[model samples]
Every structure is written in C-alpha cells, then in structure tokens.
Target: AMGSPIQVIENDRASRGGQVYATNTRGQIPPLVTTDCMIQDQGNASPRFIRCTTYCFPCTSDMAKQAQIPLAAVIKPFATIPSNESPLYLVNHGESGPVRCNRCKAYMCPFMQFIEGGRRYQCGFCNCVNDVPPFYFQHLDHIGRRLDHYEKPELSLGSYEYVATLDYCRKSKPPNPPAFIFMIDVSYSNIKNGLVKLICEELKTMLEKIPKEEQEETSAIRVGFITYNKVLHFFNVKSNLAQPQMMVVTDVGEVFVPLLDGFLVNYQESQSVIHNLLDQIPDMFADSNENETVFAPVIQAGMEALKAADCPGKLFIFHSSLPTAEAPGKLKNRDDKKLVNTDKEKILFQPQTNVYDSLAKDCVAHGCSVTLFLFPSQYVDVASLGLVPQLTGGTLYKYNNFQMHLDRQQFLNDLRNDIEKKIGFDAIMRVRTSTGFRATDFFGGILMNNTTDVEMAAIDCDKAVTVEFKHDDKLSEDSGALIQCAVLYTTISGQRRLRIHNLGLNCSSQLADLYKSCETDALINFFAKSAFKAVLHQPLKVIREILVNQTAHMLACYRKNCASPSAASQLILPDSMKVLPVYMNCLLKNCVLLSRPEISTDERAYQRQLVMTMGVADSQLFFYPQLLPIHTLDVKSTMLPAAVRCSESRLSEEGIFLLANGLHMFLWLGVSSPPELIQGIFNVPSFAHINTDMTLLPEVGNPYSQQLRMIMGIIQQKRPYSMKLTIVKQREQPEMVFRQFLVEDKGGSSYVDFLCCVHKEICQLLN
Candidate 1:
C-alpha cells in the first residue's frame, strides 16, 4: 500500500512538518522531512548525514570540516602516497597498470567509503580487488615481463669469425745423391795398423769429391765390399781387388798400380798414397783363438751386403778393434788382468755381442741408415755403440785419435754430407739370374697387386743374372711384372746369387697400382676381405660353446621362474639351523605340510598313525610321548587334537564360505600359522611365546607408555579375537595367543590342557 511517495526531508523537520497545513487554500505542504531532529554533524568532521535527513546542521562548518577532513585529505593528497610507513598494500599496479586509478577505467580502482548519510558518491572505481603482494611482489614489472618472455639473450660475444688468413707454407727438401752404404768392418778385427791407414785416407777423400759431373756415372761413388771373418766376402770390384781384371772405375784403366797409386792420391797428395794403401792391406788374423767375437758372422755379412747392395744406402759401420781372442780373462784381485781383460771384453762386447743390434736390425730391415764408427778400441765400446746410434737413426763417431788419420778433408766433407742427406733415386727394379740363386728363397716371387701394366720375360740362360728392386712409387707399366722368373746361382761363397722365380703376369696388377697410390684404401680393403674370409669360413670351438651354453640356459630359466618370495620371507629354515635338526625338520615340515594342505596334516599321515597306534607299544612308548617333546607334538598329540578341531571347523566353514561365495581363494589359503606352530599351541614357555614373548613385551612399558600400551594392547588383544582372528585380522597379522599345558605324571597336575581352537571354540580363556 505504499506505492512510492515517502520522501523524508528534515531540516528541523521541515519547519515542524510545515504548519501551513490548516487545510484548503494555503495547501503547499512541501516540507515534511522526518526522523525527528537529527543532529548528525559534530562539526568540522565531514560526513554530515543526509539520506532522509531531519535537520542535522552545523555540518556547514565547512560541512563540519568536510566531515573532519579526509577524502584523501580532501581528494588528491594520496595519489600513491604510501612511501612505506609499513604500507604493504599491493595489487594496484601489479602488472604495472591501474596503480591507483590510472585514469580510472578500473583495472583495479574501487576504494571509497564515506557513506554516513549517503547521497550517492560510491563507485571507488567499482570495488577493486587484486591483492597479491608479499614476497616483494617478486620484483615485479610484471615479473620482468614474465622473465623476458622466457629468457635467452645472454651472449656476451663469440659467435666465431675472427679474420686472419695466410697458412699454406710447404717446405720439405733433403734427400738427393745420398746413397752411402759403407759398412766397413773388414773384420780379422779390422785388419791392422792405423786401421788400414784410416780407411785409405777416408776413401781418397771420398773419391776426389766426385762432382766432375758426377764422375761420368761409372762408379758414381759406388763402392761395395763385405768381409766378415768365418765367411762372407762379396767384394767383386772385379774379383776382390789386388787387380783381378779391374772392373768398372772406368775399368781401372791405366792403373799405375801401387793399389792404384794408393787409391788415386790426394789427401795432401796421398801422404805416401796413404802409406801405399796401408802397406797393401793384409794383416788379417783373429779367426778365433776362441774369445767369442764372431758377432754372428758380422751380422750375417751386414745383412747380406745390405741385401746385395739393393742400394739407396747409409750404412757406415767401421768397428775397428776387438777380438784379441775376444779378451775377458779375469781381474778380481785388483791387478789389471790385462786391463781386466780389456774392460771385460768391452762390457762383454757391448751388450752380449750386439753387432750394433744386428746392425740396427739390418738397418731397420733394409731402409738403411746405421752409422757407428768406434775405431779406437781397447775392445770396442763407445758408450755401448752409443745406444746403437741412438736407436737406429744412426750416428756415433768416436775415434778419439788413434794416431789421427781419419780426417781426409773432414772425411770428404762428412762423406759429402752423408751422401747429400741420405740418398733418394727410388724407383728400382731388377731380376738377373741366368744361372745362380738364393736371395732368401727368392722372397716368394715379389708379387704386389691391383694391375696397371706389369711385364717380365726371361729365358735367355747364357747364365743370365739380375735382381734389383726398389720402389717409392712410379713403377707402373705393371712394375715390369716385378721381374718374373730368375734363378741364377753361385754363393757358397763364390758369390753371384739371384732368385725371383715368378711374379710375372701383371705382378698383382702392378701392386694394385702401388696400393692406390698409397692411400691404402682401408688397409687394402681390409687385407683383401681378410684374405677372402680366411679362404671362405672357419668357425669351430665346439660351435662356440654350444652357443654359449644356450645363452646361459635361457638366463637361468628366467631367474628361476620369475622370482618373488612373497615379499621376502620364505625362509623355512637354512641358516645352518642349530644341528640342522634333520634339515630343520625337513624344511619346516615341508613348509607346513606343503604350505598348508588343507591345514597341514600328512607327515605321511602322521607316519601312518604312529605305526598303527604303536601296535607294539613301548617302542620308546610309541616315539617318545613326553620326555622333552614340546614341538613335534608327541608325534601327533592325539591327531593334533583332532587336527586342531578340524582346522577350526575348516576355518569356520571357509569364513562362512568367503562371506557367501565371493571366494577370495578360500580366504587367502594357508593363512600364516607357523611361528613355531604358534609357539607349539602356546603352552608358551618356548621362551614364553608371542613368537618368543612378543619381543619382551616392550621392555615392560614407558617408552612413552610403550607405543601407547602396545597399541592399547593390540586393540584389546584384537577386539575379542575378531571372528577367531580372521586369519590374523585379514593380514594386519601380529597379535597371537595359544595354550596347551599338561604336566601330570604325578607332579600335582598342571593343566590348561589345550586352548587354541578358535572358531571351533576351544579358546576357553586359557583355562
């Protein structure tokens, strides 16, 4: 019934309800504001009430000082003035937007509150609410623009192109007319006096410095001679010198022979032509009065005259003295037994007769370069041949003035700088055997392989003889078939020798184009497919141990049939059980009779009812009835009290048929029984049983009241045996009890006879 006209005005009740209301004609009653005399403005405090006002004046003291001043101290003094007076208020400019009405369209604006007598002024930007401030608002600029939109910029210089250039250098050089091959140990302990006048004044100053356009190439400084003691000669400079048809040195033509005027006179006009070629060279003697200095026939005749002078050399050798009956006679009483047998035969011929370790292993198997001079010898030992010329890269001079002589113009300028730094002309090939042979059984006919053009032919036989070969690479034209057939003869000391019997027809395709110009394509295609799979297959070793024992018997039958010993505790005894009572009673009675056979019975039907109830009685009273048998329960304590009352009435009829057919495997079959058969049906003292007295019942209390009285005594002994302890309360197991005493035999009747028959009810509170 009040459809809308209730405007209540009241400035002194609109002058007392506007009295000109005496009806009719002066009828303009426009002032009936009510709520009786409302004095709302306690001056100068601002909020001067107004809504349905009833004259609350004095607010006009500047509106009671604008309701006691504070509309933010009258509107603008706090634009954000909370410069920290414990003013942790946030959320306004969180992502830096509406910090306090950023021109107020409200990303967060609201905060008004002076509505005492409200006449409208309310939307503090419509109730703002964003608040997440505390942790220093995580250094906000809206969290650094969300971590600069997922971070990455830290480069600090180094992406790569530093600009430098130049590089190609190139160099190499050394190796020209260097082929030396001296090997001078003309043994008979280096034939005498001034060592053949210091090797004929160092070979006539190395043949008058050769360079007369390389001495017309005849003996281009070539000299070959080998001489070992008990056999090895090879000297054919036209048959061992002393003038046997003077072969090549330009046929030794016009020889005014005094050993060719002492090898062509020069070192100061041949100082008596090196004393007439060291007085015609013949003092040779030591062929062994037996002091062991043969040195394996001078390292097998300097590895057969450097494999028959297959030339590009650098051998040197010159071991002058040693072998005065190879010294070493004895010097112990401190008397110089001939300087202790020449310093113990020069330290036993420097390392057990090493002829410089077989001439540094035949000058590293023929790529020659052995040096070793050691001339002045009380029996040769220049610091043990200076470790064989420092392990084969040769050089060990040591003469120490044996009456000087070896200088001949600095030994022909160090033999022309060791033959211009170790000789080079590489490409060599030869096969000469018209009749004599042997080059170590012809080295399996020099075959090489892969073809580019090789050729070789022989059948001359006017005693044809040739055999030379070298190769750095440039022998195509099929490496002239590596000089095919050659087999001449001679050497049983007559000399000659050649052999290469056949590497003809394209000598393995010109040694496979020198093995593809030596890059050796994956080691010659892995040794030619491992010699063609070792000539096609080879396996054996009893079929590799029967395929490794059939993969270890299928991984030991997959870890013994998928392992899991029921969460680990299927012990059943074997940690050396005491005396292993018959193997811990046959493994806990066969794990409680085959792990619970309808509740453990058959130890062969209790040994066939103790042999028909001890038909022959006193058989130790049918297996010792009570003397000390607490466990194996008197062989079968009356069939285990009727099989524990028929297994507690078949576990209470299978726990009421598994609560009526939801069959949980007859409610978890074999439900854990053994703690020594529940301490032998608990007559307890098998150490007072809860499997040995529940671990001494918590040391009788107060470990904070012992786990709250052992969990309130196991929930008051498992709440009235919770349905005959539903197989240990459906597995939260632990709590247990049993009783079965029976002392008698006149010890005044101890009783508690049998008690653990739970669901079949014999638990008579342990009578």
Candidate 2:
C-alpha cells in the first residue's frame, strides 16, 4: 500500500570505521549506507560506544511481536574515545552523590522530564515522580526544560561518569592497585620452544610499562613470578634480597602460597631483583627433562596469593601443551574428527571436566582473572582448559605451532599490550531500561553470578558485552524508551567510580519506522555472538539454517509491511538495509562460524573466543576483510591507497594487493608481478625467486619499499595486537586460504545465489 522510488544515500566517510571502499563499478555492489543514527556527536551516545539494534522502540507488545526484531544493545563500555571527539564529562553532585529515582533507583539521565518549575522530576524508567533536592534543583524554562541542562553533562549528554560515594565500594572500603602474577609453564616443551626465554627478556624491560593509577606517588602495580612443571616454583624477589629465591611445592592437589610477604613485590622498588630473577630462570632449567605440567594448581596458587594480599588481580598463565599430570583440572585428548558433523559434536565444545568451571567460580569470588597464552602443537582441549578464562572474565591467546624465531615479535607485542592496557578491577555492570523492557541475556567474556549484574574480575578496553532485551509491558509513545548502563568499578589507580551511559529512543508503532532505523553493524555483532553461544545447545548445521531463516524473515516482513507489492520476481530491500543481505551471506561464510572439517576443535574454540568478545568495528572486518590495491603508488598521498572489493576479478597478473581481516594480514602477489616492484619490496629479481613464506618485508632503499613499510606500520599501530603477515603467491596452496577471505566468491554458496535463495524464501513467506 505504501512505497517510494529506490532511495540513494550519499556516502559520509566520517560516520563509519574501517578503510574499505566499494566505488568501482567493475567490482561487487557497495554494501553500506550511512544512516542518520550513525552521525557522530548527534546529541546521542556514540554508536561506537553502544549501538542499539533498532533506534526506534516498538510502542506496544503487539508491535514488537509483529516486527519480529529483538531489542538489543551491543555495548563496548571501555571503547577508546577518539581524539577528535570531546572527552566524557565527569559529574560530581556534592556529598549526597548522584541523584537517582526514588522508586526504581535508576540514575538520573537526559531523558528524565522536569516539571513543576523543576521542583519535581519524573523518572524516565519507572515514571515515578520525585521532589528535587534544593542543592541540585534548577528552574524550568518556558519549554519545560531545566535551565541548567546545557551546563550539566548528566542532564544533557548521552554518556558521562559520576563520582561514586562510599556505598558503591565493597564493605565501604577503598580499593588497592591490581596485581599481575606471571604463571609460566617451564616444562620441557616450553623450555625447548624458547617461550620461557622470550617471556623473561620482555618482562625484564617492562618495569616502566606497567599500568599505574592517576596521581599516585609510587608505583601501585605489584608483580610476581611462578614457574611450574610437575611442581610449582614461586619466586621471592624482594628488594633487599641479593638474589631471588625459588621455593618449590610438589603438592599439586592442595596448592598454597608459600610466603606472601616476599612473593609479590612493588615493581619500581624491586626492579633489580625482578631483573635478576628473569635472567637466571631460562638457564636454571635448560637441561631439565620435566615434560608433564599441572595446569589447575598454577591458577589455584595464584588465586591464593591474591587472596593473601586482599586484592583482585590477573593471573597470566603461559602453557605449551596439554596438562597430562595428576592435577585437579586434568584433561583427556578429545580431538575427535569422527563427530565433526554429528549431533554429538556439541560434546567437543563442552568442558571435558567440571573442575575448571568450579575453579573459575572460586577465582571470580576472590577477584582473580585468568589469562591463558597457549602454544600447542597438538590437541590441547581448549574446550576443557579454556573454561577458566571463559567464566572468569579473561581472554585466551593461542599461537599454534609457535616458533620463537618467526613468532617472537607478535607474542611479545601481545604480552606488552596486556601488561600496559588500562584495566578496571572488581567491576559490576547493570543495564536499566524503561518500564516495559528488561535485559534478558548477556554475551561476552564475563561472569553472571546473579540475574542483573555482569561481574568482571578485571575489565579492560578491549572487552565488550551484548545485552538482549525483552518487553513485559506497554511503552508510552510520548515518553519513548530510555536505557541506562551503569558500571561500578575500581580504577587501576584504585579509585571507585561509576560510568553511566544513557540512551533515549523514539517509540514507533509502524514496521517501516523500525526498518529505517536499524543499525546493521550492531545487528551482525549480535547475530555472530548469539550464534557462537547457540552451538553449545544446537547443532552447527541447525544454527546456520537458523541464521538464514532469521535473515529471510526480516526481509520478508519489511517487504510485506513496509514496501509496495509489485511483481513476485522483484526483490525489494529497504533503503537503509540495502546491504543487509550481503552482510548476512558473508556472516554465514565466516571462518569463525563455518563448520568445516579442516578447522580443528582448538582452532574453532579460539576463533569463538575472539568473536564472542570483539567490538562492532572488528566484527565488520571479521565478516568482510578490507582489500586494497598496492601495486601503484601516489607519491603525494599521505593515507592508504583506495580499497578494492575482495574479489579475484580485482586482481591483475602484474598487480599486488594487501588484505587485512583484523586477525591476519596477507600480501598477495600475482603470477607475473612486475620485477621492478618485486625488487623494490622483496629484494628479488622476479616473482619466481621471491620468498613466498616470508613473514616480514625486507628493507630496501627504494621509494616503493619505504612506502609499503610505512603503510604496514600504520596498519599495525591501529590494532590492539600486531597481525601475523602471510605472503600469498597467486598459484600457491596458500592462495586458497587467501581466497576464502574473498567473501563475495563461492564457499558454501556464492553471494548471488545466497541472495536469490533469500528472495525465494521471502516470496514464500510473503504469500
């Protein structure tokens, strides 16, 4: 009944992240259309900070049921604030602390309505009216808004922080600086692999890089070292010691800290002893034949140390292989390829033993998080061993077949970022919504002990959580919907504070309004994380079908209710969602979500770990990698070259291309690449002599070589961890792996066929 001409939107580069472009007519169709909600600094919470699946909320339960799109918000609470935008404003409301609703207890936000000359304010969430305090009261203007709204960030801006009172802290006590204990596996596998030596060298020079609280006189971060094989080795590196002392405990069943006084020392005051301890560790066990290591007890030992210190901290565990020793969390080899596509495949994704789950719960209780750095060559049962990090609000990093010579720099860079990144301890986050809706599920690397709060032992900048929302009552169109996310955390410098993010959405009864306001990136992020969790209960094949069904139903509803009905063969897509089909096809083919026999269970778990917690921007690259042509250079250009579609057709026999997918970077050289360019970049006369397996570009004094190096440097700096480089030759076997990233081509199905299938499903659904 209602329709308009096919809408064309102008591209606004400032609204989106990623460097990919799709302007060339010869390539695949462009997939992104900048929406009004994507505008930065638009008096709303930045989409990068927290983006809702739909900007307009359904006004009634019936409307929501009809729309069929779940109300959710993907929040990256600690996302980095760009330098170009204004920083988050801090608000202090004197001794009374920040104002809150009397009934609902929700924090005051911009959506609260002022009335009675500003003497009374109505709570946006619960509709409870409360009298304003004299200290915080302001007169309302003729338009029924507070006079001081513009001056106060709490009253106007969408995101801000508040100075928390004593009530926000545990037992009303101040917090202490976080402690980081390095738990290194010194078994024969780790020692021979040179992981022990590399870690020691990196830590010896990282004294000043440790994170500190703001305005603290002395260093607050504490450091400790523990090495283990069959038994645990604790280091005492006190400032007064001539040399660090090593204490060994062989009782793996009952792990305990030997000496709490000298074990964890202040980094600045005891740098010399720490350096001395690191120097002798590799040589002390160089000739050892200890092959078996206890995994669970290492974490239990570190938990005991943090408990003794009466502070929350992170345990950095480095392991080389499976823990086959007689320990509490021992795991069996469960890498069964026979169950790859069967109903029993879910068992491979589940924990082999419940011991690690209980151990992780205890760690969360005592304020300890576990970070696992796995260097496994064979099966390590990431499903069983990785549960500790999964439940304790931590991360898992894997380097399959790690070699010190080729992978040393990436390993060290990841370690450095973890040690120096800003972190919050003993944190609890809650999302409050308006009268009708509530948060139902939380997805991320976090712990959920109760119903409402998301507990994290240590929350860092790279962490994110997607919250699912459900409606229970009717929402008023006049008031719309309001959401507030409040996170109470202890700063790295040991201060307790509350970070608040407020969002106000419009209420709509029509499906067309909701379809026009959707956020594609946030929607894909929700689907990816939700499907990753779904694999535990549902089969991988069923989950893939569910994704396709969900996409088809969405477009079907939009076409039936919002677009004008024409011929059955014509596929009508909403103006704002022109690219949704393309993104969905790529998501179905994503390596992280694909159910292929070539992917090992350990590798699948690692990819799931990343996809579950990555933010929206990184998720975009995970679905569709950025491809750029690098064969030609513009001498006057300061930025990267124009991006091309991730299609083989964009490649030329004499061209070179670079592709980055946020995890790995590939340099693809065509078969007949120019000898002059090859000599400039790879120091080879022709493509035949090029080192196709080289990880790093050689230094050549040519202008093209310098330009390529500069671009590589810039790309690496933008990411949290350095990407591993893979040089791909056109006719080599590695090219198949590179081609998989060319998402528009065939894998499970080509983009064109997938879209056609979606249209067929939509036509069936419409009739």
Candidate 3:
C-alpha cells in the first residue's frame, strides 16, 4: 500500500530497479520474450522508463549450471520513494474483467504470448494456451495485431497493478484506525540512565505525529501506555476523566486487565489526558526500589486491552533488562566469552528460549506485533529475546551502553522517524509462477505462517523478506518463465490494497548467452540471503566455506564451460559477476560472522538479525562500509564516484578519509594532513596533527568546511539511520578501530588476491 518513492535513484538501468527500498528493479530481467535481450533504441526511446533489472531467458541446465546465474529474485514490498513527486501505480492491461489464464489463474500480461490471430494466448509460466476472452475482443480494429499495444503500460512500465473487484474495496466490517501500545520498562537502570525520561518526552511528539481527526479525516488512531517493573501499571486516557488515572497490578506471573473500557480509547478525544500521563510517568516511578522487568505481565495486559478493542495494533516496548521468570516469559544472560571463540558460537548464535516466541505467537493470533527497543549496558540475552520481534514481524532497535548526552538524541530521532513513518498492518503475500519453476521456501524477517506464501502481522517502512526458488522440471525453452508477487495489506491510515509486480523472461540454451546478460546487483542480494540461511543452522566457519565453494564453482563453471576466448585472460572475470566477490567479502566482514571478544551476546544476536532483515541499501552498506576520501577534491568541480579500498594500504599521510558503515561513520585523519585543512574545518591548528585525542568537526562557516559538511550531509541523507562521525588519528587510537574497515585486507584477500583465488579454483577444471 506504500507509494510514490520519497527518493528514487534510477540506477543506470542499462534494465531498469528498501530501507523498508523496493527495487523497482528486482534484477536485470529479459526485456520481453519477443523483444531483443538488450534494450537498443539508439537514443530515440519513448518517454516511459523501465524500472526492473532484467536478464537473459532461462537456458538448459547444462548452460545454466555452468553460467552460475541465480534463478531467484528478491524484493522490498512497500517502500516510500526516500525523496518524491505525485504517484506511480502498476496497472493491469485489461480495463474490465481480469485477463487470467483459465488453466493456471495467471494474469494476462505482455510476458505471455498471443496466438491464433490474437484470439488466444499462451502463458509464459505454465506455457499453456487458452482462449482470449470475448469481452476484450476487438475485431473492429484494422490493426494487424489487436491487443492495444499502444496504451499498454506493461509494455513500457513493466509493473502491472491488477484491478480487483468491489469485493476488495469492501471488507466485511468498517476499517478501524491502526492502534499502538507503548510498554516501558521502569527498571532501575532505565530510570537511572535517563532512558525513561528520553522515551517519555519523545512519546509526546511521537503521538502528535500519528494522523489525527483534524489533521486527517480518516484518523481514528488508538493508543495506550503501560509502565512495568516487577508489576504492571496501566492508564485510562478518557479526556473527561479529570486527569489520567493509573491502575497498578502487582501479580507478576499472570495478569488480567483491571478494566478495559477506558483503555485503548481514541487518541483524538484523549490527547490532553495522554499528555498529562506522559508528564507524570518519570516522577511517579522515580527512585523506586523495584528493578525486575516482568515483561509477560506488561505484554499480557496489552494483549487483553487490545483484544477488547478488537483492532490490529503494534506494541512498542522499551526494555533494558534481562527479564526475571517472575513473568511467564523470561530470559537469562548466557555470556561465555570463551565459547564465542569456538564453533559453538553458531549454535549459540540463535535464540535460547521459545518463551518469547510462544508469547509472540499469541500476539500474532490476535493481530498484534512487538517492537523491541533494547538499551543494554550489559548482556540482556537477546539470543532468546530477539525472537519476540522476529516472530511478530516487528523491528528491533539496539542502543548499547546508552548515555543520555551521547545516545539519547539519536535514539529519539530514530524512534521518531520509525513512529512517524507510514506503515502497513496485516500484510499477506503470495508469489506465483509459471510451470517450469517453483518457489521452494522463503527467508528473511517475515514470520512465515504459511507454507505456500507469507503473512506479516505488520510491516514497517524499511523492512524486507526473501524467497528461494527451484526448477520443478527441465528443458522447456519453447516458451518463457513468469514470476508475480502480490502483497495485500492495510495502510495505517485505514485502507486495504494489493500491490502486484509481474516479471517476464526470455528462454535461452547457451551458457555464454546467459552470462553476457547478467545483472550483478540483484544477484548478490539473493546470495546474501543464502548465506543467512546457512548461518541460521550451520556453523559460521562452515557457512563461509560453503559460500567460497559455491562462488568458486560458479566462476570455474563460467571459465571451463564457456569459451568466450576472454575466459583465458589471466584474471578472467565478467564485470557483471565480479561484484559477487565484493559482496561476499563484505558479508564475511559482518559483525555476526566475527568473533571479537568484546561483542556482547545481545550485540551478537542483534547483528545477526540486523544483516538479514535490512533493506538493500543498508545491506549494501553493511556488506562493504562506504569508503570516501574526505580530502579528495573534484578537479572537475563535481563529485566523481570516488570509492577507496577499506585497507590501510589506501590510507595516505596527507589524506583524511570517511568510512561509513550505515549506522556509524569514522573519519581517519593522517598525521600529515594539512593543518590549514584542519584549521578551516575543525578550527584547530597543528595540535598533534594526527594525534588528536578525539575526532570532532566544528559546525563551521567557511568554504573549506562548508564543502566537507556538504559531503557529510549527503552521506547522512542517504539513510534513515543517523551516523556518528568519530575522528580516528594514528598513534592516538590503536589503528585497529580504523582497520576494521580494512575487511578486504584481512584473510590475505585484497582485491587482487580474491580474484586470484577465484581464478585458481577455475584453473583446476580448465581443459
């Protein structure tokens, strides 16, 4: 139901493409079954632009296995154009009744072929033919091929939005506004560290942002609040009730709502009372001796209240403790640093309890999901706790050793961004295909409650899910292949709609043919999901081994099986496929795969989930932290697509670089960096040059500083998460902190080295 991208970077679709960025281009796909492999208009193309990454049609197994192309596709269902215009909708070709195949229920699309004088059509997927409906029959046209080719948006747009019946616009009952419950943990640590205060003050603004009746006529937003320590505290926000009334439930193990009428009331009518309660939360629980977090009591109370309202909603939990078993669901610290160094880390990498998962199931059954905001200075055991969000299709926000001055502001910003963003509720996804292939399983964060499809209790702005594919049979190039994804969800403001995407592919039989038509960017995303699958059940070391093995075989097959003559080049590489190793290198460097001694169990578990659930942009940033030469100026007076290697080898005595890994940016200043460059930027002069104690850039007013700040602003603008820039100078901090970006340099696998590794594996199979 999300629309008109907030930002759209039309990747030089040479096919045309989720922070929670949808690839208008999923992968480079075939232009059309009838059209040529490459879109060659010689510059006189039409006004419409294609949005998907396309590829060569499917070839025989002999050519496909050797070609090492992924038949799989990945997508972000609902993404707001990070920047934008009016709107874009994928439209169905037929104006009246659905043009579906009688045999397979496949929608009539350009991907399928028309035969028998345009009176009959063959499905690209099922490769089956059936009658072209009499209703859409246009015998009056004198045109040779009468399928309305001129007005067909599918011909150029490629994206197709189907026209569902009025049955779709009319649900059984009137839609209710989306609901949200804020559950704050009032543990000593949260109150003492000032997290509670930060969360409460922000809640005031956060609530104001959700659509209200005056601001939006459809706004019937419902919200409630609860604060929990060893007990649960609930609020009644009915405006006429003098001031907000609080009811405390002391039974920690099992909880029943004291009253349901006033709780979960309409926010518009209760705004004043809501604001009053937010003001009193901090002082009412200040300095309370009780510190245990009885989470289940808080959750159960929310479940009870939400159930009575009978509306789908979200649960916002601010937690910073290892909840005690005094609650139905509990977790404990399983911190063993020594075990982290062993293969057991993989087994330990996943959750330790089904308690959180079981309770998440109960919430899901009643149409509720949970967002876990964990602020931990010590291990709160996310291995077990992380599942709470994963199972309910919600988000997990982590703030380590949160300090009010340093962490609170960013936390508030991110939390606000997440809350204010428009989201969907009760999303159900179903992906169908043509006869030659079958979608085997799905991966990523969506709670897979269905065997044939996917169902998410809720989906936020920048989250994604992946699907795996396989061939059901073999050798069927007489026709084409088809893939369509349909996502049905209710918008937060209260509208139910379905977003559909249909893909078309040509068929081929030669390995070299497919190799030349590959789209690397979309392919690597599928590989990342595969790596995540292995990490879930297999050891990290074993997972990497398989990754290297699979990658090597694909390259080797391309070399020995295809005789492109250039295959004999010393480091024979296809430009389209070369990005694979780059992506893999970044994957290996991820925090989840590493065994650094200092990473907390909570941090480790969080990292594992973060990599798997992140949208493409953030995933790419995670795969290879962005490396830009901060001091590199444009001789052309324009930014070149400048990227440096992560290794220290790329570092220079006179240079300053910025390494951005999405969430954080590290500024590395060399000892010889001109002090004037320093003075103009930081307002400092030769203080230690590179030996500065801490890295801080002044909010300056000069051209030198302005240009650099412009670059910084651009980097920050790219992602929703804000990045903290830490200045790293040599001899002051162990270069180890800065060297982590040098992920490519480690394992003795520099760019050249990784190429050689691939070539060497290919050499063994050479004739």
TM-score of each: 0.17, 0.94, 0.85
Report RMSD (Å) for each prediction in the order shown.
50.4, 4.7, 6.3
Instruction: Give one digit per residue, the lDDT tens place, for model 2 in 1-767.
Output: 11211122224344333443321111111223232222243245666577777878888877777757778888888877766557788899887889999887898887688998899998878989999988998888988767777788888777889988888777788877778899989989988888898888878887678886457776687888999997999988898998899899997898899987887899888888888888999998899898788898888999999999988899999998988888888878877664536877677788877777788888988889888888999989888778888777788888889877677887888888888877888888999888988899998888888999998887888788999988868877677777889998887777788888877777877787888777677788899889888878877788888898888888888877888768787787775566677778887786555665567778777787788887777776777777778887665385777667667877898898888887788998999888878887887788888766566647764778788878877666647767878898889558877888888788578778888999888877856
Instruction: Give candidate 3 regions above 4 Å deviation.
Output: 1-54, 61-63, 82-86, 90-103, 107-124, 127-157, 160-174, 211-215, 337-344, 475-478, 565-569, 596-598, 634-641, 689-697, 732-734, 747-751
Models ranked on TM-score: 2, 3, 1
Best by lDDT: 2
**Which one wins by TM-score: 1 or 2?**
2
User: Any idea how many clashes model 1 has?
Assistant: 43
lDDT of 2 at 26: 13
User: Each model's C-alpha lDDT?
Assistant: 0.25, 0.79, 0.65
Q: Residue-wise lDDT of candidate 3 within 142-248, one digit each (tens)? A: 53345465455543334445544434442455445668889998878888888888888878877777744345664666888888887888888876886988889
Q: List the residue pairs that clash in candidate 2.
A: 213-493
- Better model by lDDT, 1 or 3? 3
Better of 1 and 3 by TM-score: 3
Model 1: per-residue Cα lDDT at residue 248: 20
